[PDB]
Amino acid sequence: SLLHTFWRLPVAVFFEPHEENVLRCPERVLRRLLEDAAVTMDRVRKR
Amino acid sequence: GLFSLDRSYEEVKAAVQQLQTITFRDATFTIPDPVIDQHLLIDMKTACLSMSMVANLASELTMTYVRKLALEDSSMLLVKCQELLMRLDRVSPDDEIARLSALFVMLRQLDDLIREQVVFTVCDVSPDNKSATCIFKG
Amino acid sequence: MAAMEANIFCTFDHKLSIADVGKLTKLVAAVVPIPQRLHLIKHYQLGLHQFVDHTRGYVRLRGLLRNMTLTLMRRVEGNQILLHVPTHGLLYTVLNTGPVTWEKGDALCVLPPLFHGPLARENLLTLGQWELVLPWIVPMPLALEINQRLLIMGLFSLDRSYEEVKAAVQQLQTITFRDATFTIPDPVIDQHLLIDMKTACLSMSMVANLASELTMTYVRKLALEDSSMLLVKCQELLMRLRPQHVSPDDEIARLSALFVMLRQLDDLIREQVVFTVCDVSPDNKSATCIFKG
């Protein structure tokens, strides 16, 4: 499910979060997100 | 001078015919040819050989040196540079020392053409255009 | 404030001997770096002794020396040094101190000194843990060679060992400009050298890109027909192994940008002409010069 980046070589970052938005999160916090996102969510009327 | 060796073809004679004349304000003036009798003078031979050498070494060593520098890349600029060079591109260290010194000596044998120091700047010309007043500059 | 005064009186605050003033009166019409440009400065700012860091970074000192003020020395009397500031393009003489031979018609440049040791025996004003070290005035070939060799050492010191770089240090430091030997005093890798290397590699990639077809393959075409000593000396420094298209209105802009890029490369080692000697003295100690500063 990996994306197709246009730029071939990865670019270094030193930007403070006011300047730009980044996706720096590892896999384990996203496993926590999957655990917290998967579990968080008639005939009697005619009778 | 760079069209010296391939002078035999029929298009490049018209190309150097186009290149032979210049245009200024009402000056449709043309220059003599540097090549005489289908072989270049040693002066312009050195002048063109320096350019061909610096191009052929820049297209060879800069990739290795920019990928050496890319681990200490502390700017958002050198990575675009090496990406550009990678998109173009599709031993004992004394050879590297000799190649870098050859690069810089062929640069040193070139500085007669890379620039020109301003000498005079006009201030007012004479009417009928035969003399002017110029402050001298170094 | 008042403007740039023509006269800077340097006053030695110490007591002095007689022999030190005897050396001081020999050093008239020499060059000094001055950072302050007041009227009645002390002797601390006079000379490069304020700049000797514990690394003595030669590219750092080389970058710092151009930022100072070159000034000439005159009127060596008792505890007074009349420093004549320079002006654009006048004619007054100089006096060299380094053992670099001079000829006529060439340019000159200011530089930090070379092979810095007491074996050279600089008799340069020892008093009060302060030695007046003077900037060398060298001609343009020696200055271009030392700048290109320092840039070669900077660019070469990437991703290599701690023995092959020492093998390059012991090989490269010898200079034999005009039958005289000069070594490089303590060259260190530095951040100033690093950013100059960065600009140099970017300019090298820009000439690698902006070169056209014929502008690269001209030497390969010439190696098929003509044969000289220069081509066999350079072609075995290159690699081993009918124009298809040609458009002169494209090549004109190609070389128009290419000269700009080669200027941007070569300006990093050909620093600034600061003196152009018209004629010299035959004993090669002084010279009549043009364009002070």
PDB file of N, CA and C in Angstrom, chain B residues 2-6 9 11 19 40 45 48-49 51-60 62 65 68-69 71-72 77-78 81 84-85 88 93 96-104 107-108 110-111 114-115, chain C residues 144-145 148 151-152 155-156 158-160 164 194 198 201-202 204-205 207-209 211 214-216 218-222 225-226 230-231 234 237-239 242-243 246 248-249 255 258-259 262-263 265-267 270:
ATOM      1  N   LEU B   2      34.316  26.092 -31.605  1.00  0.00           N
ATOM      2  CA  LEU B   2      33.821  24.755 -31.309  1.00  0.00           C
ATOM      3  C   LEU B   2      33.261  24.038 -32.529  1.00  0.00           C
ATOM      4  N   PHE B   3      32.991  24.748 -33.624  1.00  0.00           N
ATOM      5  CA  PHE B   3      32.555  24.119 -34.864  1.00  0.00           C
ATOM      6  C   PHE B   3      33.711  23.881 -35.823  1.00  0.00           C
ATOM      7  N   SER B   4      34.912  23.672 -35.294  1.00  0.00           N
ATOM      8  CA  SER B   4      36.100  23.562 -36.127  1.00  0.00           C
ATOM      9  C   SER B   4      36.262  22.183 -36.745  1.00  0.00           C
ATOM     10  N   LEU B   5      36.091  21.125 -35.950  1.00  0.00           N
ATOM     11  CA  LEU B   5      36.380  19.782 -36.439  1.00  0.00           C
ATOM     12  C   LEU B   5      35.297  19.274 -37.382  1.00  0.00           C
ATOM     13  N   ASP B   6      34.043  19.636 -37.133  1.00  0.00           N
ATOM     14  CA  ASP B   6      32.917  19.167 -37.936  1.00  0.00           C
ATOM     15  C   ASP B   6      32.543  20.156 -39.032  1.00  0.00           C
ATOM     16  N   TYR B   9      30.490  19.514 -43.024  1.00  0.00           N
ATOM     17  CA  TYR B   9      29.100  19.273 -43.382  1.00  0.00           C
ATOM     18  C   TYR B   9      28.457  20.531 -43.955  1.00  0.00           C
ATOM     19  N   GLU B  11      25.285  21.807 -43.483  1.00  0.00           N
ATOM     20  CA  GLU B  11      24.422  22.637 -42.654  1.00  0.00           C
ATOM     21  C   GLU B  11      25.242  23.573 -41.776  1.00  0.00           C
ATOM     22  N   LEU B  19      26.292  32.512 -37.350  1.00  0.00           N
ATOM     23  CA  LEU B  19      27.064  32.915 -36.181  1.00  0.00           C
ATOM     24  C   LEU B  19      28.119  33.966 -36.503  1.00  0.00           C
ATOM     25  N   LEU B  40      42.256  24.273 -36.544  1.00  0.00           N
ATOM     26  CA  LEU B  40      42.167  25.359 -35.584  1.00  0.00           C
ATOM     27  C   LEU B  40      43.552  25.852 -35.187  1.00  0.00           C
ATOM     28  N   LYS B  45      42.375  26.383 -29.993  1.00  0.00           N
ATOM     29  CA  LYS B  45      42.376  24.968 -29.634  1.00  0.00           C
ATOM     30  C   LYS B  45      42.480  24.789 -28.129  1.00  0.00           C
ATOM     31  N   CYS B  48      39.091  26.055 -26.526  1.00  0.00           N
ATOM     32  CA  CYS B  48      37.985  25.108 -26.592  1.00  0.00           C
ATOM     33  C   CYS B  48      38.278  23.834 -25.809  1.00  0.00           C
ATOM     34  N   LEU B  49      39.551  23.428 -25.751  1.00  0.00           N
ATOM     35  CA  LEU B  49      39.926  22.218 -25.036  1.00  0.00           C
ATOM     36  C   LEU B  49      39.730  22.382 -23.538  1.00  0.00           C
ATOM     37  N   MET B  51      37.354  24.217 -22.137  1.00  0.00           N
ATOM     38  CA  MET B  51      35.914  24.109 -21.923  1.00  0.00           C
ATOM     39  C   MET B  51      35.449  22.661 -22.003  1.00  0.00           C
ATOM     40  N   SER B  52      35.955  21.918 -22.988  1.00  0.00           N
ATOM     41  CA  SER B  52      35.568  20.518 -23.117  1.00  0.00           C
ATOM     42  C   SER B  52      36.088  19.686 -21.951  1.00  0.00           C
ATOM     43  N   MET B  53      37.271  20.023 -21.432  1.00  0.00           N
ATOM     44  CA  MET B  53      37.823  19.290 -20.300  1.00  0.00           C
ATOM     45  C   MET B  53      37.055  19.572 -19.016  1.00  0.00           C
ATOM     46  N   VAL B  54      36.683  20.837 -18.772  1.00  0.00           N
ATOM     47  CA  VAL B  54      35.966  21.133 -17.533  1.00  0.00           C
ATOM     48  C   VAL B  54      34.553  20.556 -17.591  1.00  0.00           C
ATOM     49  N   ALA B  55      33.942  20.510 -18.783  1.00  0.00           N
ATOM     50  CA  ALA B  55      32.638  19.865 -18.906  1.00  0.00           C
ATOM     51  C   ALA B  55      32.737  18.356 -18.706  1.00  0.00           C
ATOM     52  N   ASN B  56      33.760  17.726 -19.290  1.00  0.00           N
ATOM     53  CA  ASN B  56      33.891  16.280 -19.201  1.00  0.00           C
ATOM     54  C   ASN B  56      34.324  15.812 -17.818  1.00  0.00           C
ATOM     55  N   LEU B  57      34.982  16.664 -17.033  1.00  0.00           N
ATOM     56  CA  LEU B  57      35.268  16.305 -15.648  1.00  0.00           C
ATOM     57  C   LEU B  57      34.118  16.631 -14.705  1.00  0.00           C
ATOM     58  N   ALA B  58      33.345  17.683 -15.005  1.00  0.00           N
ATOM     59  CA  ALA B  58      32.168  17.978 -14.203  1.00  0.00           C
ATOM     60  C   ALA B  58      31.103  16.913 -14.369  1.00  0.00           C
ATOM     61  N   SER B  59      30.964  16.366 -15.574  1.00  0.00           N
ATOM     62  CA  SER B  59      30.016  15.286 -15.805  1.00  0.00           C
ATOM     63  C   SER B  59      30.504  13.939 -15.290  1.00  0.00           C
ATOM     64  N   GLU B  60      31.665  13.879 -14.645  1.00  0.00           N
ATOM     65  CA  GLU B  60      32.220  12.620 -14.175  1.00  0.00           C
ATOM     66  C   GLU B  60      32.429  12.567 -12.671  1.00  0.00           C
ATOM     67  N   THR B  62      31.465  14.972 -10.166  1.00  0.00           N
ATOM     68  CA  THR B  62      30.547  15.694  -9.294  1.00  0.00           C
ATOM     69  C   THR B  62      29.536  14.756  -8.650  1.00  0.00           C
ATOM     70  N   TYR B  65      31.276  13.103  -5.700  1.00  0.00           N
ATOM     71  CA  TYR B  65      31.520  14.034  -4.602  1.00  0.00           C
ATOM     72  C   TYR B  65      30.225  14.505  -3.944  1.00  0.00           C
ATOM     73  N   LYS B  68      29.161  11.696  -1.747  1.00  0.00           N
ATOM     74  CA  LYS B  68      29.964  11.736  -0.531  1.00  0.00           C
ATOM     75  C   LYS B  68      29.455  12.807   0.426  1.00  0.00           C
ATOM     76  N   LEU B  69      29.075  13.970  -0.104  1.00  0.00           N
ATOM     77  CA  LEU B  69      28.627  15.073   0.739  1.00  0.00           C
ATOM     78  C   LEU B  69      27.211  14.883   1.271  1.00  0.00           C
ATOM     79  N   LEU B  71      25.688  12.739   3.039  1.00  0.00           N
ATOM     80  CA  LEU B  71      25.487  12.361   4.434  1.00  0.00           C
ATOM     81  C   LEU B  71      25.611  13.560   5.365  1.00  0.00           C
ATOM     82  N   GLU B  72      26.470  14.523   5.022  1.00  0.00           N
ATOM     83  CA  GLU B  72      26.578  15.782   5.748  1.00  0.00           C
ATOM     84  C   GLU B  72      25.727  16.882   5.121  1.00  0.00           C
ATOM     85  N   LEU B  77      19.084  22.035  -0.401  1.00  0.00           N
ATOM     86  CA  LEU B  77      19.568  22.473  -1.702  1.00  0.00           C
ATOM     87  C   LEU B  77      20.430  21.439  -2.402  1.00  0.00           C
ATOM     88  N   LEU B  78      21.321  20.774  -1.667  1.00  0.00           N
ATOM     89  CA  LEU B  78      22.217  19.795  -2.267  1.00  0.00           C
ATOM     90  C   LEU B  78      21.478  18.527  -2.685  1.00  0.00           C
ATOM     91  N   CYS B  81      20.138  19.073  -5.987  1.00  0.00           N
ATOM     92  CA  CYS B  81      21.290  19.055  -6.878  1.00  0.00           C
ATOM     93  C   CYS B  81      21.669  17.634  -7.279  1.00  0.00           C
ATOM     94  N   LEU B  84      19.003  16.173  -9.507  1.00  0.00           N
ATOM     95  CA  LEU B  84      19.226  16.667 -10.863  1.00  0.00           C
ATOM     96  C   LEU B  84      20.322  15.886 -11.566  1.00  0.00           C
ATOM     97  N   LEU B  85      21.436  15.633 -10.873  1.00  0.00           N
ATOM     98  CA  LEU B  85      22.552  14.924 -11.495  1.00  0.00           C
ATOM     99  C   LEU B  85      22.204  13.462 -11.776  1.00  0.00           C
ATOM    100  N   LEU B  88      20.186  13.411 -14.833  1.00  0.00           N
ATOM    101  CA  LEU B  88      21.030  13.519 -16.024  1.00  0.00           C
ATOM    102  C   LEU B  88      21.655  12.185 -16.392  1.00  0.00           C
ATOM    103  N   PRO B  93      43.579   6.794  -5.174  1.00  0.00           N
ATOM    104  CA  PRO B  93      43.244   8.206  -4.920  1.00  0.00           C
ATOM    105  C   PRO B  93      44.184   9.214  -5.564  1.00  0.00           C
ATOM    106  N   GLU B  96      42.501  10.618  -8.396  1.00  0.00           N
ATOM    107  CA  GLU B  96      41.549  11.658  -8.021  1.00  0.00           C
ATOM    108  C   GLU B  96      42.246  12.989  -7.772  1.00  0.00           C
ATOM    109  N   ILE B  97      43.423  12.948  -7.137  1.00  0.00           N
ATOM    110  CA  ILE B  97      44.212  14.162  -6.917  1.00  0.00           C
ATOM    111  C   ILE B  97      44.634  14.772  -8.249  1.00  0.00           C
ATOM    112  N   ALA B  98      45.096  13.921  -9.172  1.00  0.00           N
ATOM    113  CA  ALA B  98      45.502  14.377 -10.496  1.00  0.00           C
ATOM    114  C   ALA B  98      44.320  14.923 -11.285  1.00  0.00           C
ATOM    115  N   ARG B  99      43.139  14.325 -11.122  1.00  0.00           N
ATOM    116  CA  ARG B  99      41.969  14.787 -11.858  1.00  0.00           C
ATOM    117  C   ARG B  99      41.472  16.126 -11.333  1.00  0.00           C
ATOM    118  N   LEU B 100      41.505  16.323 -10.013  1.00  0.00           N
ATOM    119  CA  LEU B 100      41.069  17.604  -9.462  1.00  0.00           C
ATOM    120  C   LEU B 100      42.063  18.717  -9.783  1.00  0.00           C
ATOM    121  N   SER B 101      43.365  18.409  -9.751  1.00  0.00           N
ATOM    122  CA  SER B 101      44.353  19.406 -10.152  1.00  0.00           C
ATOM    123  C   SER B 101      44.281  19.699 -11.645  1.00  0.00           C
ATOM    124  N   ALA B 102      43.929  18.699 -12.461  1.00  0.00           N
ATOM    125  CA  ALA B 102      43.720  18.934 -13.883  1.00  0.00           C
ATOM    126  C   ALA B 102      42.506  19.818 -14.121  1.00  0.00           C
ATOM    127  N   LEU B 103      41.442  19.601 -13.341  1.00  0.00           N
ATOM    128  CA  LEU B 103      40.252  20.445 -13.406  1.00  0.00           C
ATOM    129  C   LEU B 103      40.587  21.894 -13.090  1.00  0.00           C
ATOM    130  N   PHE B 104      41.339  22.113 -12.017  1.00  0.00           N
ATOM    131  CA  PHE B 104      41.640  23.483 -11.640  1.00  0.00           C
ATOM    132  C   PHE B 104      42.695  24.129 -12.531  1.00  0.00           C
ATOM    133  N   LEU B 107      40.762  25.198 -15.484  1.00  0.00           N
ATOM    134  CA  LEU B 107      40.064  26.432 -15.141  1.00  0.00           C
ATOM    135  C   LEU B 107      41.006  27.627 -15.155  1.00  0.00           C
ATOM    136  N   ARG B 108      42.232  27.444 -14.655  1.00  0.00           N
ATOM    137  CA  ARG B 108      43.207  28.531 -14.614  1.00  0.00           C
ATOM    138  C   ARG B 108      43.664  28.935 -16.011  1.00  0.00           C
ATOM    139  N   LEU B 110      41.798  29.489 -18.498  1.00  0.00           N
ATOM    140  CA  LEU B 110      40.553  29.887 -19.138  1.00  0.00           C
ATOM    141  C   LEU B 110      40.100  31.306 -18.799  1.00  0.00           C
ATOM    142  N   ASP B 111      40.647  31.935 -17.754  1.00  0.00           N
ATOM    143  CA  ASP B 111      40.120  33.189 -17.212  1.00  0.00           C
ATOM    144  C   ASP B 111      40.296  34.420 -18.101  1.00  0.00           C
ATOM    145  N   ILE B 114      36.402  34.338 -19.426  1.00  0.00           N
ATOM    146  CA  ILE B 114      35.262  34.215 -18.529  1.00  0.00           C
ATOM    147  C   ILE B 114      34.711  35.554 -18.073  1.00  0.00           C
ATOM    148  N   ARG B 115      35.441  36.645 -18.280  1.00  0.00           N
ATOM    149  CA  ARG B 115      35.022  37.939 -17.764  1.00  0.00           C
ATOM    150  C   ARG B 115      35.706  39.032 -18.563  1.00  0.00           C
TER     151      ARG B 115
ATOM    152  N   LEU C 144      46.810  31.517  -6.400  1.00  0.00           N
ATOM    153  CA  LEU C 144      45.861  30.626  -7.055  1.00  0.00           C
ATOM    154  C   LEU C 144      46.203  29.166  -6.794  1.00  0.00           C
ATOM    155  N   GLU C 145      47.500  28.832  -6.769  1.00  0.00           N
ATOM    156  CA  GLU C 145      47.906  27.457  -6.499  1.00  0.00           C
ATOM    157  C   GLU C 145      47.602  27.051  -5.063  1.00  0.00           C
ATOM    158  N   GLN C 148      43.715  26.669  -4.776  1.00  0.00           N
ATOM    159  CA  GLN C 148      43.210  25.470  -5.430  1.00  0.00           C
ATOM    160  C   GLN C 148      43.687  24.206  -4.723  1.00  0.00           C
ATOM    161  N   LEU C 151      41.451  23.905  -1.634  1.00  0.00           N
ATOM    162  CA  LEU C 151      40.132  23.411  -2.011  1.00  0.00           C
ATOM    163  C   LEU C 151      40.173  21.944  -2.420  1.00  0.00           C
ATOM    164  N   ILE C 152      41.282  21.497  -3.017  1.00  0.00           N
ATOM    165  CA  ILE C 152      41.446  20.082  -3.337  1.00  0.00           C
ATOM    166  C   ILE C 152      41.535  19.253  -2.060  1.00  0.00           C
ATOM    167  N   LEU C 155      37.867  19.212  -0.559  1.00  0.00           N
ATOM    168  CA  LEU C 155      36.964  18.338  -1.294  1.00  0.00           C
ATOM    169  C   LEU C 155      37.407  16.881  -1.231  1.00  0.00           C
ATOM    170  N   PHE C 156      38.698  16.633  -1.044  1.00  0.00           N
ATOM    171  CA  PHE C 156      39.203  15.272  -1.033  1.00  0.00           C
ATOM    172  C   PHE C 156      38.995  14.577   0.304  1.00  0.00           C
ATOM    173  N   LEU C 158      36.493  13.895   2.068  1.00  0.00           N
ATOM    174  CA  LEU C 158      35.155  13.362   2.285  1.00  0.00           C
ATOM    175  C   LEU C 158      35.174  11.852   2.107  1.00  0.00           C
ATOM    176  N   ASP C 159      34.658  11.137   3.117  1.00  0.00           N
ATOM    177  CA  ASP C 159      34.406   9.692   3.080  1.00  0.00           C
ATOM    178  C   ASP C 159      35.680   8.896   2.804  1.00  0.00           C
ATOM    179  N   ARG C 160      36.772   9.326   3.421  1.00  0.00           N
ATOM    180  CA  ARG C 160      38.049   8.649   3.290  1.00  0.00           C
ATOM    181  C   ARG C 160      38.650   8.462   4.676  1.00  0.00           C
ATOM    182  N   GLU C 164      44.836   7.681   4.411  1.00  0.00           N
ATOM    183  CA  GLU C 164      44.992   8.147   3.040  1.00  0.00           C
ATOM    184  C   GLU C 164      44.916   9.666   2.953  1.00  0.00           C
ATOM    185  N   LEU C 194      33.892  24.005   4.404  1.00  0.00           N
ATOM    186  CA  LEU C 194      32.774  23.130   4.065  1.00  0.00           C
ATOM    187  C   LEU C 194      31.738  23.846   3.202  1.00  0.00           C
ATOM    188  N   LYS C 198      30.641  23.230  -0.602  1.00  0.00           N
ATOM    189  CA  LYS C 198      29.240  23.069  -0.978  1.00  0.00           C
ATOM    190  C   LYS C 198      28.904  23.887  -2.218  1.00  0.00           C
ATOM    191  N   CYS C 201      30.687  22.260  -5.262  1.00  0.00           N
ATOM    192  CA  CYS C 201      30.033  21.071  -5.806  1.00  0.00           C
ATOM    193  C   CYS C 201      28.733  21.419  -6.522  1.00  0.00           C
ATOM    194  N   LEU C 202      27.993  22.419  -6.019  1.00  0.00           N
ATOM    195  CA  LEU C 202      26.794  22.861  -6.728  1.00  0.00           C
ATOM    196  C   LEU C 202      27.140  23.466  -8.083  1.00  0.00           C
ATOM    197  N   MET C 204      29.805  22.766  -9.831  1.00  0.00           N
ATOM    198  CA  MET C 204      30.278  21.657 -10.656  1.00  0.00           C
ATOM    199  C   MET C 204      29.121  20.864 -11.248  1.00  0.00           C
ATOM    200  N   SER C 205      28.044  20.686 -10.485  1.00  0.00           N
ATOM    201  CA  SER C 205      26.880  20.033 -11.071  1.00  0.00           C
ATOM    202  C   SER C 205      26.174  20.927 -12.076  1.00  0.00           C
ATOM    203  N   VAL C 207      27.656  23.119 -14.129  1.00  0.00           N
ATOM    204  CA  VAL C 207      28.374  23.001 -15.402  1.00  0.00           C
ATOM    205  C   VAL C 207      28.215  21.592 -15.973  1.00  0.00           C
ATOM    206  N   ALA C 208      28.044  20.576 -15.116  1.00  0.00           N
ATOM    207  CA  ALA C 208      27.762  19.230 -15.607  1.00  0.00           C
ATOM    208  C   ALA C 208      26.415  19.144 -16.312  1.00  0.00           C
ATOM    209  N   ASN C 209      25.449  19.955 -15.893  1.00  0.00           N
ATOM    210  CA  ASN C 209      24.148  19.966 -16.545  1.00  0.00           C
ATOM    211  C   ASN C 209      24.098  20.898 -17.744  1.00  0.00           C
ATOM    212  N   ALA C 211      26.304  21.955 -19.784  1.00  0.00           N
ATOM    213  CA  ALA C 211      27.106  21.630 -20.952  1.00  0.00           C
ATOM    214  C   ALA C 211      26.243  20.940 -21.997  1.00  0.00           C
ATOM    215  N   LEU C 214      27.980  18.986 -28.037  1.00  0.00           N
ATOM    216  CA  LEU C 214      29.300  19.211 -28.614  1.00  0.00           C
ATOM    217  C   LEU C 214      30.281  19.754 -27.585  1.00  0.00           C
ATOM    218  N   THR C 215      29.786  20.518 -26.604  1.00  0.00           N
ATOM    219  CA  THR C 215      30.633  21.089 -25.564  1.00  0.00           C
ATOM    220  C   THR C 215      31.240  20.025 -24.663  1.00  0.00           C
ATOM    221  N   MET C 216      30.635  18.841 -24.601  1.00  0.00           N
ATOM    222  CA  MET C 216      31.272  17.720 -23.932  1.00  0.00           C
ATOM    223  C   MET C 216      32.063  16.847 -24.894  1.00  0.00           C
ATOM    224  N   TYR C 218      33.622  17.442 -27.636  1.00  0.00           N
ATOM    225  CA  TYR C 218      34.642  18.052 -28.485  1.00  0.00           C
ATOM    226  C   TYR C 218      36.016  17.415 -28.291  1.00  0.00           C
ATOM    227  N   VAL C 219      36.375  17.067 -27.051  1.00  0.00           N
ATOM    228  CA  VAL C 219      37.674  16.437 -26.833  1.00  0.00           C
ATOM    229  C   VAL C 219      37.677  15.015 -27.390  1.00  0.00           C
ATOM    230  N   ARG C 220      36.532  14.325 -27.338  1.00  0.00           N
ATOM    231  CA  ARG C 220      36.430  12.991 -27.916  1.00  0.00           C
ATOM    232  C   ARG C 220      36.492  13.042 -29.433  1.00  0.00           C
ATOM    233  N   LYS C 221      35.971  14.112 -30.031  1.00  0.00           N
ATOM    234  CA  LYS C 221      36.111  14.291 -31.471  1.00  0.00           C
ATOM    235  C   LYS C 221      37.545  14.637 -31.845  1.00  0.00           C
ATOM    236  N   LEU C 222      38.210  15.460 -31.030  1.00  0.00           N
ATOM    237  CA  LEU C 222      39.560  15.897 -31.363  1.00  0.00           C
ATOM    238  C   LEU C 222      40.566  14.770 -31.184  1.00  0.00           C
ATOM    239  N   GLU C 225      41.322  12.785 -34.540  1.00  0.00           N
ATOM    240  CA  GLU C 225      42.035  13.367 -35.670  1.00  0.00           C
ATOM    241  C   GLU C 225      43.389  13.945 -35.281  1.00  0.00           C
ATOM    242  N   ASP C 226      43.431  14.868 -34.329  1.00  0.00           N
ATOM    243  CA  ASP C 226      44.689  15.499 -33.960  1.00  0.00           C
ATOM    244  C   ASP C 226      45.311  14.774 -32.773  1.00  0.00           C
ATOM    245  N   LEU C 230      49.702  17.556 -25.263  1.00  0.00           N
ATOM    246  CA  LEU C 230      48.675  17.996 -24.325  1.00  0.00           C
ATOM    247  C   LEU C 230      47.498  17.029 -24.305  1.00  0.00           C
ATOM    248  N   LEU C 231      47.121  16.508 -25.475  1.00  0.00           N
ATOM    249  CA  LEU C 231      45.977  15.612 -25.553  1.00  0.00           C
ATOM    250  C   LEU C 231      46.288  14.247 -24.959  1.00  0.00           C
ATOM    251  N   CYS C 234      46.211  14.834 -21.121  1.00  0.00           N
ATOM    252  CA  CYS C 234      44.898  15.023 -20.512  1.00  0.00           C
ATOM    253  C   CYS C 234      43.925  13.885 -20.785  1.00  0.00           C
ATOM    254  N   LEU C 237      43.753  11.257 -18.349  1.00  0.00           N
ATOM    255  CA  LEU C 237      43.078  11.654 -17.128  1.00  0.00           C
ATOM    256  C   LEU C 237      41.566  11.654 -17.273  1.00  0.00           C
ATOM    257  N   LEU C 238      41.057  11.617 -18.502  1.00  0.00           N
ATOM    258  CA  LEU C 238      39.647  11.362 -18.760  1.00  0.00           C
ATOM    259  C   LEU C 238      39.381   9.860 -18.709  1.00  0.00           C
ATOM    260  N   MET C 239      38.151   9.466 -19.022  1.00  0.00           N
ATOM    261  CA  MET C 239      37.826   8.056 -19.123  1.00  0.00           C
ATOM    262  C   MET C 239      38.279   7.514 -20.475  1.00  0.00           C
ATOM    263  N   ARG C 242      30.032  14.370 -37.220  1.00  0.00           N
ATOM    264  CA  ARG C 242      28.648  14.169 -37.630  1.00  0.00           C
ATOM    265  C   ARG C 242      27.656  14.465 -36.485  1.00  0.00           C
ATOM    266  N   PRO C 243      27.383  15.750 -36.250  1.00  0.00           N
ATOM    267  CA  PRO C 243      26.490  16.114 -35.145  1.00  0.00           C
ATOM    268  C   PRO C 243      25.050  15.737 -35.454  1.00  0.00           C
ATOM    269  N   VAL C 246      21.940  20.322 -34.058  1.00  0.00           N
ATOM    270  CA  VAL C 246      22.718  21.525 -33.786  1.00  0.00           C
ATOM    271  C   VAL C 246      21.820  22.741 -33.973  1.00  0.00           C
ATOM    272  N   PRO C 248      22.338  26.811 -33.065  1.00  0.00           N
ATOM    273  CA  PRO C 248      23.240  27.819 -32.473  1.00  0.00           C
ATOM    274  C   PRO C 248      22.539  28.843 -31.599  1.00  0.00           C
ATOM    275  N   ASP C 249      21.259  29.117 -31.861  1.00  0.00           N
ATOM    276  CA  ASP C 249      20.464  29.984 -31.002  1.00  0.00           C
ATOM    277  C   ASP C 249      20.148  29.355 -29.649  1.00  0.00           C
ATOM    278  N   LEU C 255      26.064  28.688 -23.533  1.00  0.00           N
ATOM    279  CA  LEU C 255      27.354  29.219 -23.108  1.00  0.00           C
ATOM    280  C   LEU C 255      27.212  30.521 -22.335  1.00  0.00           C
ATOM    281  N   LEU C 258      26.779  29.219 -19.100  1.00  0.00           N
ATOM    282  CA  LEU C 258      27.946  28.432 -18.734  1.00  0.00           C
ATOM    283  C   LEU C 258      29.095  29.309 -18.260  1.00  0.00           C
ATOM    284  N   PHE C 259      29.265  30.483 -18.868  1.00  0.00           N
ATOM    285  CA  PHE C 259      30.288  31.412 -18.397  1.00  0.00           C
ATOM    286  C   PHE C 259      29.938  31.972 -17.026  1.00  0.00           C
ATOM    287  N   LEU C 262      30.878  29.167 -14.626  1.00  0.00           N
ATOM    288  CA  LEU C 262      32.320  29.042 -14.463  1.00  0.00           C
ATOM    289  C   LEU C 262      32.905  30.237 -13.720  1.00  0.00           C
ATOM    290  N   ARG C 263      32.286  31.415 -13.854  1.00  0.00           N
ATOM    291  CA  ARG C 263      32.633  32.540 -12.992  1.00  0.00           C
ATOM    292  C   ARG C 263      32.318  32.229 -11.539  1.00  0.00           C
ATOM    293  N   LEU C 265      32.234  29.373 -10.157  1.00  0.00           N
ATOM    294  CA  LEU C 265      33.211  28.413  -9.662  1.00  0.00           C
ATOM    295  C   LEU C 265      34.551  29.086  -9.379  1.00  0.00           C
ATOM    296  N   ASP C 266      35.091  29.815 -10.353  1.00  0.00           N
ATOM    297  CA  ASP C 266      36.448  30.328 -10.237  1.00  0.00           C
ATOM    298  C   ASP C 266      36.570  31.542  -9.330  1.00  0.00           C
ATOM    299  N   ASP C 267      35.462  32.170  -8.931  1.00  0.00           N
ATOM    300  CA  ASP C 267      35.570  33.267  -7.978  1.00  0.00           C
ATOM    301  C   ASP C 267      35.888  32.797  -6.567  1.00  0.00           C
ATOM    302  N   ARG C 270      40.080  32.716  -6.871  1.00  0.00           N
ATOM    303  CA  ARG C 270      40.789  33.884  -7.394  1.00  0.00           C
ATOM    304  C   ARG C 270      40.231  35.091  -6.648  1.00  0.00           C
TER     305      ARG C 270
END
